[PDB]
Design a protein around this ligand. Structure first.
Ligand SMILES: CC(=O)O[C@H]1C(=O)[C@@]2(C)[C@H]([C@H](OC(=O)c3ccccc3)[C@]3(O)C[C@H](OC(=O)[C@H](O)[C@@H](NC(=O)c4ccccc4)c4ccccc4)C(C)=C1C3(C)C)[C@]1(OC(C)=O)CO[C@@H]1C[C@@H]2O
Ligand SMILES: Nc1nc2c(ncn2[C@@H]2O[C@H](COP(=O)(O)OP(=O)(O)OP(=O)(O)O)[C@@H](O)[C@H]2O)c(=O)[nH]1
Ligand SMILES: Nc1nc2c(ncn2[C@@H]2O[C@H](COP(=O)(O)OP(=O)(O)O)[C@@H](O)[C@H]2O)c(=O)[nH]1
Ligand SMILES: Nc1ncnc2c1ncn2[C@@H]1O[C@H](COP(=O)(O)OP(=O)(O)O)[C@@H](O)[C@H]1O
Ligand SMILES: [Mg+2]
Lengths: 428, 441, 346
């Protein structure tokens, strides 16, 4: 059976994981003791996609914390779901990075990545058949950008034929939570585009817009933002866990959604997001969900596809629904909005339908999209990058710990060449 | 006596095999536990007929079918479902991984290490036979296993078995609708390798059945169950002459002689004209004169291909029920009188006919109705050139930029194979043009 | 304004293939080449820019070795002296005429000696006291998208095949970090360096024949001429660098027919990926000359990446394709032709 390893790097990754497991358990019935108290049998059948089996019908997941500041460890341990994790997988270091990428790739990461891969291999060889990996990490920081990219570069060198996703929480346009985001992000994309197979750009301003406008939450915290990211993470691994009339997996989505090896950056989305009162004034059907999954305000990418052209789009439904509606509505989108699609791929839409829906819904959905528009994310970074590298603002914190300007110009030119690759398939 | 093996390959294959055996078990009387309450009360006869099923000493009847998906998700529904105690475990879950919508994994990488068991079980099921005639392969262009595994399996069977009717019941890509961006790349490469080894490849399309089920059965929100429960009836109409008695029993070696003039045009179609429900089961006589026209009437075909844009190289009409032959002759004459239904100069006869006395059954929990007479029309046209032309156009639009090719070369493939599979479809699009030009006296 | 100028060369029957009375599938007329099967049902045509009909030594337009040199490489020389850069590609399945076409035999050589000797003669003619000439060579390979150097005498260990890396200097472009650069002014040095190199190349035995190349191999030359003499004194401000890059590439290795798993398939996959990226580069760069806005994917492969400054802008690329006319090599042959065809295309 197919199996996944979930590596978690940085505060964002380790705080998303505590929510992702909190949900996958709920979908599989596991309690915070590791024990099963579900009702159905579908929960335990393909449970090895994420979990492993312990002594007394307990279940222990394949999670690997890789942080370098223990401030985030005890938050996960002393939580509602921390007493199931394997303590040998709680890797931590001391003398943290400092929102530096060189202190996560070269100095402190080179001391700990051996200890981390010694656990990754253990949790791999216990798999009868490994499909791939998962890395939750936030560009803009030190350990999620540096140590995560290092682990990608080494896991792929060790396990190249498999899959290596990454649910990168990319920066935001307006208000960033770090001054040297652009450096840490460009030097991460320089090593992600060459060592990834499908990457999922997530942006927090878009999740704020979703939490405010669609869900009508006046007090949205990060637990609510991670509650959406978890949902998306679940959607891709649904037809791998639960059955369906037309199944899917990581690799089918990779073949369909990655025309070329570099353009694998995706704008995700999940439907039906609605307010807690407006659920009386709706109808959970396929067309309403397709309206949401294609609307600009639901995508977690902080970038409007109305500015660009969908090169390739996917959809992973869940629930007892029709395939005819699934085909017709997506074709209606291909036709009605044909300007926002490519002509040298006539069918720009993939489909995938499970039959076992989430804990309390009669039907759900999921959305992945590869659009030219995401060039705006990177071009912007470049326009930040050379604003600072041209004057060498925060460079001496990167060189002193081991780096050169060459490693910066390499990443700048690669990012800009990728901005140009998405640009030719936008106008003509 | 006269056996036929069924090789379901892929998700579509199993989702159709379940619908087919749900019908073949209800017709003959077999239960999901392989038992028979009715005929044993009498103590004689062969109702659970030995064409598709086997037999044992304790009454258990076992189908002659092999299942394979390279993915557990489908076959485990059989193992955990209602028909778990029927099949021998020859259902091949080798699905440590799937073919990822690429023809390269099903053909070379993930195909090897799995095919030998399929051949071995086919051999074990053939030794039980006493004059088998057939290999009905269910598969799906556009996927990986159905595209690749079918090709490899047929390539091995045509060597190891040889002069046996290796038939195919395939799903053709809808021209607008689809569920894969790299479906044409798989379809073309499937055809290029199967165009030699196969003998007759029937073809359906899920868009046409949708249009039908909303026009005739009046289903606005269908599933794949309602499509496979209609495909099972086509296959039963094909296989009825072996399982049951009948005036003009028509076997499987007779299709490939009547419908396949040349070995490269073995791509016929199918249609089931009485697709009416109980609301409309009344108010209609459902005689042969209506059905034989319905089978030729567009908006009732099962591949969206207008034969008015083409011609007819052959046609086979397999009736079943209270059908008198004279009505069939009158119907065929009426069809020959019409000007829209065009026929080639090199086939004035055109038709083959088959009649059986067993009507179609009614799978309960279904959408069809109980009719006293049903028909299946197989047909070979010059119209299907339009569809291969469309798929080649898509292939060209995508392969001019070499899109999605890295996934294929990553699993043992070469661009030469793409161009080679292209040109051998241009040759076929030229053959369809050559034969459809009337003979120069 | 770049030009590409791909070509073909059909070998004659070897004596072994003669005594079998093997058949002839490749034919010509004017310039166009065609492949007529033994079935004589499907007929093809592959018109080219240049065609070297070496099927006999009797036919008109017999493209001998001197002809192949003087028609392709000599323009590259005349451009390398003009201050431009040049690349040559040598594609061909095993048994097609490749090494004979690049290197040759002692009695009728190939392209490489006729390149280096024309170079040295024009140099020692132009070698005045005012302007000088400095040739610096290198010889490296590629293997599973890893870089390796073929100018070191490995002490016998498991390996000292240093998996070198590619970097991007902004002005001077891509380069290999840690590359030996030997100096040469007499041709007999290059032969010794190549004979120490190609022994260290990568290859293994398989079905069709044993000595089959399984790694691309680049042979690079750098001509720097110190002409600049400033008026006020002995100053040399500007100095012209000319890069020549002759690469012997491998075959495609259709692996559906040849059973191969483990390392051999890992090599074939990478060769096919590199060949596809190279075809994409050339099909975009031929359209570059026609003012159509197109982006060239140099980065998807090390081979096309390290030569971004030798296959773009101001340069003259070239591709020569050696194919057999035998009938047991029709599947292979056609592939090569189609490859070259997608490079020329107009
Ligand atoms: C009957 C009813 O109206 O309750 C719904 C509900 O109100 C809505 C609004 C739920 C609710 O979700 C939210 O309000 C929300 C707020 C911020 C961020 C994310 C969600 C709900 O909490 C969420 C919850 O969704 C689930 O049941 C899934 O299990 C969800 N995860 C969890 O519930 C969960 C359980 C334990 C611990 C942590 C999370 C899920 C989603 C995708 C994949 C797997 C699981 C459900 C039905 C509801 C409530 C409970 C109100 C919605 O949630 C989702 C993900 O579909 C929000 O809009 C949808 C539609 C639902 O109608
Ligand atoms: N009629 C019918 N067609 C189906 C069904 N399920 C899938 N299909 C067809 O199958 C195609 C999708 O690819 P599949 O045939 O499922 O490929 P596969 O057999 O699952 O093998 P993989 O590619 O490895 O997943 C779609 O174009 C559908 O038309 C079904 O239940 N009924
Ligand atoms: N969604 C979400 N984002 C977070 C969370 N914590 C941090 N971030 C984002 O991550 C960035 C900081 O990265 P950080 O986790 O500090 O990286 P690190 O210091 O190297 O571990 C900021 O831009 C935040 O927006 C979280 O819990 N949820
Ligand atoms: N133009 C030519 N004229 C005569 N013989 C040739 C010609 N080209 C190739 N050959 C013969 O073909 C053989 C090629 O061998 P080899 O150098 O291994 O070619 P490749 O490297 O392409 O396989 C040589 O033995 C040579 O005699
Ligand atoms: Mg499948």
């Amino acid at each position: 059976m197919r199996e996944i390893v979930h590596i978690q790097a940085g505060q964002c990754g380790n705080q998303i994981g505590a929510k992702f497991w909190e949900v996958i358990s709920d979908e599989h019935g596991i309690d915070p003791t590791g024990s099963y108290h579900g009702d159905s049998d579908l929960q335990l059948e393909r449970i090895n996609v994420y979990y492993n089996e312990a002594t007394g019908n307990k279940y222990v997941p394949r999670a690997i914390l890789v942080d370098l500041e223990p401030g985030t460890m005890d938050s996960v341990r002393s939580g509602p779901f921390g007493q199931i994790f394997r303590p040998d997988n709680f890797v931590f270091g001391q003398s943290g990075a400092g929102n530096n990428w060189a202190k996560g790739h070269y100095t402190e990461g080179a001391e700990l990545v051996d200890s981390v891969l010694d656990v990754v291999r253990k949790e791999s060889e216990s798999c009868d058949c490994l499909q791939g990996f998962q890395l939750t990490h936030s560009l803009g920081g030190g350990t999620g950008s540096g140590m995560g990219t290092l682990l990608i570069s080494k896991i792929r060198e060790e396990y190249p034929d498999r899959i290596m996703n990454t649910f990168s929480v990319m920066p935001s346009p307006k208000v960033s939570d770090t001054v040297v985001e652009p450096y840490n992000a460009t030097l991460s994309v320089h090593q992600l585009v060459e060592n990834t197979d499908e990457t999922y750009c997530i942006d927090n301003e878009a999740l704020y817009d979703i939490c405010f406008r669609t869900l009508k939450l006046t007090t949205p915290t990060y637990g609510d933002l991670n509650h959406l990211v978890s949902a998306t993470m679940s959607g891709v691994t649904t037809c791998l866990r639960f059955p369906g009339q037309l199944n899917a997996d990581l690799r089918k989505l990779a073949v369909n959604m990655v025309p070329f090896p570099r353009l694998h950056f995706f704008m995700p989305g999940f439907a039906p997001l609605t307010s807690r009162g407006s659920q009386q004034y709706r109808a959970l059907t396929v067309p309403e969900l397709t309206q949401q999954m294609f609307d600009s305000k639901n995508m977690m990418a902080a970038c409007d596809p109305r500015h660009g052209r969908y090169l390739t789009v996917a959809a992973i439904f869940r629930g007892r629904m029709s395939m005819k509606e699934v085909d017709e509505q997506m074709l209606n989108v291909q036709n009605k909005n044909s300007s926002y699609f490519v002509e040298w791929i006539p069918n720009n839409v993939k489909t995938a339908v499970c039959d076992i829906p989430p804990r309390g819904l009669k039907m759900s959905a999921t959305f992945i999209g590869n659009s030219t528009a995401i060039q705006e994310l990177f071009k912007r970074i470049s326009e930040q990058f050379t604003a600072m590298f041209r004057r060498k603002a925060f460079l001496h914190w990167y060189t002193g710990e081991g780096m050169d300007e060459m490693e910066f110009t390499e990443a700048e030119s690669n990012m800009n060449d990728l901005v140009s690759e998405y640009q030719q398939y936008q106008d003509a | 006596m006269r056996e036929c093996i069924s090789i379901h390959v892929g998700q579509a294959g199993v989702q159709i095999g379940n619908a087919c055996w749900e019908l073949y078990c209800l017709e003959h009387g077999i239960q999901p536990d392989g038992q028979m309450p009715s005929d044993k009360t009498i103590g004689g006869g062969d109702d659970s007929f030995n064409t598709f099923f086997s037999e044992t000493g304790a009454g258990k009847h076992v189908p002659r079918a092999v299942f394979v998906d390279l993915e557990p998700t489908v076959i485990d529904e059989v193992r955990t479902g209602t028909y778990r105690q029927l099949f021998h475990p020859e259902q091949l879950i080798t699905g440590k991984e799937d073919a990822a919508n690429n023809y390269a994994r099903g053909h070379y990488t993930i195909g090897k290490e799995i095919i030998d068991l399929v051949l071995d079980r086919i051999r074990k099921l053939a030794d039980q036979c006493t004059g088998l005639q057939g290999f009905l392969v269910f598969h799906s262009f556009g996927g990986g296993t159905g595209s690749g595994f079918t090709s490899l399996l047929m390539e091995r069977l045509s060597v190891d078995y040889g002069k046996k009717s290796k038939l195919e019941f395939s799903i053709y890509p809808a021209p607008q609708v689809s569920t894969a961006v790299v479906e044409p790349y798989n379809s073309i490469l499937t055809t290029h390798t199967t165009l030699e080894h196969s003998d007759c490849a029937f073809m359906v399309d899920n868009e046409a059945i949708y249009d039908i089920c909303r026009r005739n059965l009046d289903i606005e929100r269908p599933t794949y169950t309602n499509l496979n429960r209609l495909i099972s009836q086509i296959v039963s109409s094909i296989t009825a002459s072996l399982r049951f008695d009948g005036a003009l029993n028509v076997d499987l070696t007779e299709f490939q002689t009547n419908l396949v003039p040349y070995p490269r045009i073995h791509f016929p179609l199918a249609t089931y004209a009485p697709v009416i429900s109980a609301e409309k089961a009344y108010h209609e006589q459902l005689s042969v004169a209506e059905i034989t026209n319905a089978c030729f009437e567009p908006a009732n075909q099962m591949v969206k291909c207008d034969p008015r844009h083409g011609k007819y190289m052959a046609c086979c009409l397999l009736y079943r029920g209270d059908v008198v032959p004279k009505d069939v002759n009158a119907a065929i004459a009426t069809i020959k009188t019409k000007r829209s239904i065009q026929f080639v100069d090199w086939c004035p006869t055109g038709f083959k006919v088959g009649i059986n006395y067993q009507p179609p059954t009614v799978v309960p929990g279904g959408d069809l109705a109980k009719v006293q007479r049903a028909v299946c029309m197989l047909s070979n046209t010059t119209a299907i050139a339009e569809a291969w032309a469309r798929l080649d156009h898509k292939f060209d639009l995508m392969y001019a930029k070499r899109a999605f090719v890295h996934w294929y070369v990553g699993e043992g493939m070469e661009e030469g194979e793409f161009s080679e599979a292209r040109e051998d479809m241009a040759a076929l699009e030229k053959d369809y043009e050559e034969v459809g030009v009337d003979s120069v006296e | 304004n770049s030009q590409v100028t791909v070509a073909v060369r059909v070998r004659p029957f070897s004596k072994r293939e003669k005594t079998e009375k093997a058949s002839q599938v490749v034919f010509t007329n004017g310039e166009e080449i065609t492949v007529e099967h033994p079935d004589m049902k499907q007929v093809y045509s592959f018109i080219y820019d240049v065609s070297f009909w070496s099927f006999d030594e009797c036919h008109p337009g017999y493209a001998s070795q001197t002809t192949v040199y003087e028609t392709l490489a000599a323009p590259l020389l005349d451009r390398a002296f003009e201050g431009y850069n040049t690349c040559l590609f040598a594609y061909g399945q095993t048994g097609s005429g490749k090494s004979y076409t690049m290197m040759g035999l002692n009695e009728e050589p190939g392209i490489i000696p006729r390149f280096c000797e024309d170079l040295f003669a024009q140099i020692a003619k132009k070698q005045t006291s005012e302007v000088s000439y400095h040739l610096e060579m290198s010889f490296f390979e590629v293997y599973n998208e890893k870089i390796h150097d073929l100018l070191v005498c490995k002490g016998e260990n498991g390996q000292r095949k240093q998996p070198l890396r590619a970097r991007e200097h902004p002005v001077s472009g891509p380069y290999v970090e840690g590359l030996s650069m030997n100096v040469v002014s007499s041709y007999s040095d290059i032969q010794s360096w190549l004979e120490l190199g190609n022994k260290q190349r990568a290859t293994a035995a398989t079905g069709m024949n044993d000595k089959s190349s399984r790694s691309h191999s680049v042979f690079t030359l750098v001509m720097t001429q110190t002409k600049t003499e400033v008026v006020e004194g002995e100053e040399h401000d500007h100095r012209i660098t000319s890069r020549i890059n002759l690469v012997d590439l491998a075959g495609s290795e259709r692996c559906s027919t040849a059973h191969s798993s483990g390392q051999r398939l890992k090599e074939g996959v990478s060769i096919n990926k590199s060949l596809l990226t190279l075809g994409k580069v050339i099909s975009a760069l031929s359209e570059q000359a026609n003012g159509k806005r197109v982006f060239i994917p140099y980065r998807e492969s090390t081979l096309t990446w390290l030569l971004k400054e030798s296959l773009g802008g101001n340069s003259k690329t070239a591709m020569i394709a050696t194919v057999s006319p035998a009938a047991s090599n029709i599947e292979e042959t056609l592939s090569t032709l189609r490859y070259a065809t997608q490079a020329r295309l107009i």
